[PDB]
Amino acid sequence: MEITTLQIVLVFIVACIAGMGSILDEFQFHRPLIACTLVGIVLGDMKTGIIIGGTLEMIALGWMNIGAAVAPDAALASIISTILVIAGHQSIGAGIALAIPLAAAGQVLTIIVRTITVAFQHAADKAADNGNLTAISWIHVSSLFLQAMRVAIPAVIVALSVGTSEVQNMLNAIPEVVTNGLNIAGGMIVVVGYAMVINMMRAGYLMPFFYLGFVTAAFTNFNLVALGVIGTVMAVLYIQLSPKYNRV
Amino acid sequence: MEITTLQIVLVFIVACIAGMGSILDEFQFHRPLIACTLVGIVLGDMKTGIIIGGTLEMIALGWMNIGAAVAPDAALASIISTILVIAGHQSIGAGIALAIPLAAAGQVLTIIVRTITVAFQHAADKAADNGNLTAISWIHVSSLFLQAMRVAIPAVIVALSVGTSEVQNMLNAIPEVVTNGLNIAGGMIVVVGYAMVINMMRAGYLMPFFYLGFVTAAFTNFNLVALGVIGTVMAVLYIQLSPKYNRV
Amino acid sequence: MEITTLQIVLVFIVACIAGMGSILDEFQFHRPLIACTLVGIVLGDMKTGIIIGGTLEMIALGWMNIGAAVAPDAALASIISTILVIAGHQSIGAGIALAIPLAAAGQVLTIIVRTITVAFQHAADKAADNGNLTAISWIHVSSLFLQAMRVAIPAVIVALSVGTSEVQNMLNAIPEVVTNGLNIAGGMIVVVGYAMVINMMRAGYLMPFFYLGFVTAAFTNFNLVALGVIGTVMAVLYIQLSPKYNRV
Amino acid sequence: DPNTQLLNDLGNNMAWGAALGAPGGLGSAALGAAGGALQTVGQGLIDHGPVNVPIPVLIGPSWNGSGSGYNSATS
Amino acid sequence: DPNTQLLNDLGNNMAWGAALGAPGGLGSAALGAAGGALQTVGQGLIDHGPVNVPIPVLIGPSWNGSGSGYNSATS
Amino acid sequence: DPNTQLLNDLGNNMAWGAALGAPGGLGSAALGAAGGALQTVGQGLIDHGPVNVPIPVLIGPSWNGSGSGYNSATS
Amino acid sequence: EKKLTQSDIRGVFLRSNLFQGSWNFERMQALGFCFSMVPAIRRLYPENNEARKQAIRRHLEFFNTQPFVAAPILGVTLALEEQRANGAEIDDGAINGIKVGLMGPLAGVGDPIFWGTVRPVFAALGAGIAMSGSLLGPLLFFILFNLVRLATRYYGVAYGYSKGIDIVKDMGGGFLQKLTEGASILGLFVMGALVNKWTHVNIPLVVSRITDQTGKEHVTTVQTILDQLMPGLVPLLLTFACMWLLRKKVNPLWIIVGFFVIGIAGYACGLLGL
Amino acid sequence: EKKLTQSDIRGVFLRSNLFQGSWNFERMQALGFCFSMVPAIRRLYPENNEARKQAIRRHLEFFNTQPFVAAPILGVTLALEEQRANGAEIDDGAINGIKVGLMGPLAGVGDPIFWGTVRPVFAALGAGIAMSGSLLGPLLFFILFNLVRLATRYYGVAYGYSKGIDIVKDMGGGFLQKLTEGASILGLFVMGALVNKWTHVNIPLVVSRITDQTGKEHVTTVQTILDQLMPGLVPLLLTFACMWLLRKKVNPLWIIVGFFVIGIAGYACGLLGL
Amino acid sequence: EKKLTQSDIRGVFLRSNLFQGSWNFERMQALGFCFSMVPAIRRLYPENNEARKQAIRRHLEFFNTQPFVAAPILGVTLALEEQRANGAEIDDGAINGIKVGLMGPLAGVGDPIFWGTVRPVFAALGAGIAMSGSLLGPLLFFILFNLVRLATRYYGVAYGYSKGIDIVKDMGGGFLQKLTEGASILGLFVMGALVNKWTHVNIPLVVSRITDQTGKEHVTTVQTILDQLMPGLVPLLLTFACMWLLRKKVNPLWIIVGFFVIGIAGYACGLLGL
Ligand SMILES: OC[C@H]1O[C@H](O)[C@@H](O)[C@@H](O)[C@@H]1O
Ligand SMILES: OC[C@H]1O[C@H](O)[C@@H](O)[C@@H](O)[C@@H]1O
Numbered sequence A, B, C: 001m002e003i004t005t006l007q008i009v010l011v012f013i014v015a016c017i018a019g020m021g022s023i024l025d026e027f028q029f030h031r032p033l034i035a036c037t038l039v040g041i042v043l044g045d046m047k048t049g050i051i052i053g054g055t056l057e058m059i060a061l062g063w064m065n066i067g068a069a070v071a072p073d074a075a076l077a078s079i080i081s082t083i084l085v086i087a088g089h090q091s092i093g094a095g096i097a098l099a100i101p102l103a104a105a106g107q108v109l110t111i112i113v114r115t116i117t118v119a120f121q122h123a124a125d126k127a128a129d130n131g132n133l134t135a136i137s138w139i140h141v142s143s144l145f146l147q148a149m150r151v152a153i154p155a156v157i158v159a160l161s162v163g164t165s166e167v168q169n170m171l172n173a174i175p176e177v178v179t180n181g182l183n184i185a186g187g188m189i190v191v192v193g194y195a196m197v198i199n200m201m202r203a204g205y206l207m208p209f210f211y212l213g214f215v216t217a218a219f220t221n222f223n224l225v226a227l228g229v230i231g232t233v234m235a236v237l238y239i240q241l242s243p244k245y246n247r248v
Numbered sequence D, E, F: 001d002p003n004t005q006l007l008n009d010l011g012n013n014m015a016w017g018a019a020l021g022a023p024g025g026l027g028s029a030a031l032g033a034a035g036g037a038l039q040t041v042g043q044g045l046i047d048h049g050p051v052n053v054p055i056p057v058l059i060g061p062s063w064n065g066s067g068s069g070y071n072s073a074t075s
Numbered sequence G, H, I: 001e002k003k004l005t006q007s008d009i010r011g012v013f014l015r016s017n018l019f020q021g022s023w024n025f026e027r028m029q030a031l032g033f034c035f036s037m038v039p040a041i042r043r044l045y046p047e048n049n050e051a052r053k054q055a056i057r058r059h060l061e062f063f064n065t066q067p068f069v070a071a072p073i074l075g076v077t078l079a080l081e082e083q084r085a086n087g088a089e090i091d092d093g094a095i096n097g098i099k100v101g102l103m104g105p106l107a108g109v110g111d112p113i114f115w116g117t118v119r120p121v122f123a124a125l126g127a128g129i130a131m132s133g134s135l136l137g138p139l140l141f142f143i144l145f146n147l148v149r150l151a152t153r154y155y156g157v158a159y160g161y162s163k164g165i166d167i168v169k170d171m172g173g174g175f176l177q178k179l180t181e182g183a184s185i186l187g188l189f190v191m192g193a194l195v196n197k198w199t200h201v202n203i204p205l206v207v208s209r210i211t212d213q214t215g216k217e218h219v220t221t222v223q224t225i226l227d228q229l230m231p232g233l234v235p236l237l238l239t240f241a242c243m244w245l246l247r248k249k250v251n252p253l254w255i256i257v258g259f260f261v262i263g264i265a266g267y268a269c270g271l272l273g274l
């Protein structure tokens, strides 16, 4: 099918919202359950969009971002796959077969943008020395635009060239090593955020509680709720003892 | 078979002893292993009584009373079932089929009596204001009589009307909701005794040990013996620390 | 086959080295992987010696000596079995069938020698009162000779009478009760070394940590590495608290 | 058709909840509209009934190599 | 017949144990009779041998909904 | 033949490692010879490849009655 | 001065056999505790002046524990009351304080041992022997259980009295508060464990009904989710609710009645399962 | 004096919706934290004298936590900054001290609850309902998730401010250091647990290949041995390496780039598995 | 003054290779400890006045630990003896105190590591390679094990001496007692774990023999009941019995002989199983 220019503008807007929601992680506009239905509404049948979103959500569960470990980015997959299904006339299974390479591509793109925003952070540092608060507000809200374009631009390119199968070919440019290598790297970058927090805490004498938390998670069946309860109990009891506080 | 009046008196006495032992929980005269054999002795063959007691004990294991949670009361079952088997000429399996409804009925009766004895407790309160110790002794030992009659009266009614199957019909008056509802309620009244003890302890700063004991029982394989050992160890070590005691 | 006198001398020397290494437990000259190859080299083919050592090592894994609990002593087995295979012309399986009774015999012999060396210890005590250091050196290095002969003498007796099957018959003198009784006894003598250390520590107020270590090893999946980490953490935290040290 | 009916129900309930909270003030208009929307979705969910999905709880970032499902305890 | 024999044995042993503790006093007559009865039941149990029952240990009030048998660890 | 070749390689490598550490001193001659021997056995092990044995870790004195293999957790 | 005769310990021991027997839902086992101390209060307070009524009211307070391990508490309070009647000043909150402190651990380790391992082991032996139908079954159970019960009662009273007359001999050395603190810690730990172990709430509202494994049907309910978050969470919340209600001076009888009504009605409505 | 108007709390609440949005690898979520406090610094420091620049630089420091549970920290720092601008002396290391102390536990229990149980439960309900294809799926997910997110954000800001204005009302009673100490203990415990639970390193170098059980093939690798010694040992060593590198004032960006290169190259070389 | 030459450390290192070799059941590894310190006592006490005999008797006391991790203890006592001979007053219970304090943990984590993981890993590699029959098996085992043993011995002596000369440089700061207390805590913990893990008592007296599951036969013994109560209870009681006997100044040799006789006789009588 062909797409009217009004639908192109609408899909651009939906893609921008999904892109911003990808980094904000607040309203969940980037989850497939919402993005797929919005694309389906602006493109045609809501029926297919809702079904694709429902099917893709079950895969996308557990696509958490955890402290500098970037997940496979459900936004780009959930948008481009439904554009390909509703407009490109493909089966739902065929479209969902494209969810994983698209997720890897979106992961690469968002990693690049998150390295770029360091320039914005340093510009905010420079604006601090002048005590300019409005500059800080503009710098913060102006770094969302990049994350919006990150999803918006490919989602317009795909929509404009739907009468071709070249997207599936471009999906093979990232062969296998980066598709799986990124997840492997993310299996270790989870450590970095915790390391930075611990380094900033500057409490070396409380480090025994770190090891205690480590081995306890390696040989027991404790939840994270249970571990939170235990940690609170030990904090309270440590403060009750510790004669630094119980001084006459 | 018919029952001589001497055997009626003897079964009344045995029922009274079992009823008192039900609440005392001291000599275990209410356990089927003893009550069944005593009824068999006073009624006829010891052989059948012993066998019924042995078979019913294996069911009655784990019919503990735990702090205001009342168990299904083995006394009434163990007495009436053997009266029905030895005198009413039924199979052992048929008599033991009646153990559970009879247990539920006895549970209801003992709950009612345990609510009644609150009047005795308040009478003891009133006797305290006069400093009358003999009144306290009489009030305490006079509250056993109700628990004796609780088992004695039905166990004489059944014996006198053994030539009828109306007991099995009266057993269907309590349909299903109270038979199972009482156990469900007892799945939560175990909490009340502990709550009352904790409320009376008035140690809010030691409450972290409660939660510590909770989660430890939810995610580990520790015994209650092991948990007792651990609790003693933590008590000793807490006292060793805690500068409130190690004051120069 | 017959054995030349030079090979007899060489096997005597190898047996002496293995015997001393049995008690020293330093260079692992008593492990079958080394003793078997050395005997094979001095006797003939290295091929068979290496293969026998490799096969017997997998059995001998976990033949640790733990604090007055004496293991089945791989040295005597690993020497006599290969002498019987290479010189006595038996199958490897048949020789390794003799590993366990020979291990039990060596266990008996080393237990006897370890009780004998108490006389050497008391002689060192007497030499202390004269302040004679050279006497102490001679007494210590002279108690190895017994452990060397312990393996050397049977390993020469066997080599000199290889043209007879009497060794397999002498192996049946220790019937079954001492072969298995020694391991059963060793299932409890592991306790004695720890008991002696604890008795010498003279720290009764730290004994709660013993029980804590006991039950933790009975109901959890913790390693010994994990238990070491936990013990270090508790030691550090106990010292951090404990107002005996945090005194103003 | 059912989707349009659901949308109409949502609109009506949100408007009614906003109207109910008018005397309380603008700070209560939101607390009324939110209640209306929540009641709409709850009523719809109750009508739908159970669901044929695994319902995961306390999962982690299983996309790297971590365990999958309930406490990362599945290899 | 075996039951009557067991009763006679119990009576004889309790009487003998009470007699043995007579010089100690009334406080030891009980400690003798109890020992006699315990020896009777122990000898009988040893003669009987093993038993065909599950022998439960550290069970709880499984009649509400708790786990059944050894630490309430059986659903 | 392979065993003799391995022995010759070990001798050559140990001699070379000892020679390399001559300027450091006698305390470094040992640190050179040990490195040579270690490199020899490591190269041989790499050539051999994997092995068909269970490779036990953290075992205990299972010869009395204790559990066998990895933390004495096998009855 | 006034001291407890030997004859007044057996009197406490003999009366402790009927420790329960006046068991209420309001003040469980309290009247039994006051009943088993009558021979002592009859000696320490020979007259009805004012201290007799105070002594009686002191022991008609809530007291719940395993019936067999209550002899040590009886002995300890015997020693404390002897000292307090002789003149040494033990407030009023150190007697009830030690009683309540010892109630916790003794009930927490008494039930899983006596109603726990001890009674059913002997009962199972006796029942198995009784399957053939010999008197050895009931006789074994009766004798073996009572020789443990009587021994623990008598020697618990004796040991508790003897050890409690040493706790007061160094009054001012901070021993009563140490003992109360340790007993409270251990009791809180074991009660927290037992609340999880021995309670059961089941809410069988089906949330998902996936069907696979050629018909395993894998039903999940609200209880499944709650158990994945924290096993026994609902009984823990109920414990806190009961504590809050008892704070507001609500009679325990109404709490128990409410629990019975909730259980029966919830099972009837089908949202409490089994 | 200068105090925060009610209108300046909503301003902090509204701006906290865009808490991320400037998310760097260098100072993650820091610019968002400084952005959501602009309406406060605009009131406490009306002029650009010198304290305005110090106040701004104070909040452009590393700050990483779960986005939803950051409202309490925002409220607490609002209270602290109000007191510090009014005159009471709060150093500079007690503000950043409390911020970093609260960062740990809130990120350690925020992720396994919001990205953990809360989001996928609603998402699974909505997805299952969406399989038939009704709007109730997405609407359910959207409404139920946002009614939790907005509630926690707004009431976290309010509660954090209210509770933080009481921590300073008794300054000198040693409350800030107590809170920092407790938060650090809990945070260290949960982070230690999460480092083991949520990381994965796999080294698939085959060590032994025994073949038995009619072809079970029982392959063991280096990872098998390491997991038998201590599960998650390699990520623990990597945590210590990262801490050492951060000690030496290495930019975190190069650490992250090195991690990406190591992962990709190791998978290409076949010694990092999956 | 008198100080230890470099040549007197190698002398201690070289003699520590024969650390065992006079291994008694009475004072295990004690004569080896006194033998490996001869080159030091030969320098600190050049004459036989009275301190030489005291120094010798100080080291002929019970000393049992893993042979490889005893170099640190040797170095620490070298430093302590150097300071004590130079004049600083360390008495006779801080030397033996630190020795016994370090004996515990080093034996508790030395055995499960050297006789535990380290030796059988190399032995299994060598044995597997030796199945084909190449010299690489024994050579691999020998070289890899001795390069760890020698390294740990030499550098343990060096590190122990160097770190022990810093513990005394601040004498009076309460460091020796801190170290002794910490070592004792860790040692007690690990020994308590090992008593449960590495002991085995089995009493195969059949209590019940239920037969079901078409012949599973479900035999239960006394050991089954004891293991349900507390695993390893009998070895724990035996540990306490041994400690009591050692309190009464019973020679350990008779305890060991009694254990051997009990084991053999019990297996013969059929009440000790396997
Ligand atoms: O948990 C730490 C936190 O770090 C960043 O702010 C984001 O990745 C969040 O999604 C994550 O929760
Ligand atoms: O355990 C508490 C205790 O409460 C009451 O006294 C009775 O139900 C006992 O059976 C129970 O043991």
Ligand SMILES: OC[C@H]1O[C@H](O)[C@@H](O)[C@@H](O)[C@@H]1O
Pocket: C025, C065, C066, C067, C068, C069, C193, I028, I029, I064, I065, I066, I067, I107, I111
């Ligand atoms: O572990 C204690 C230690 O005791 C003795 O020295 C020897 O048996 C060693 O093998 C053992 O390691």
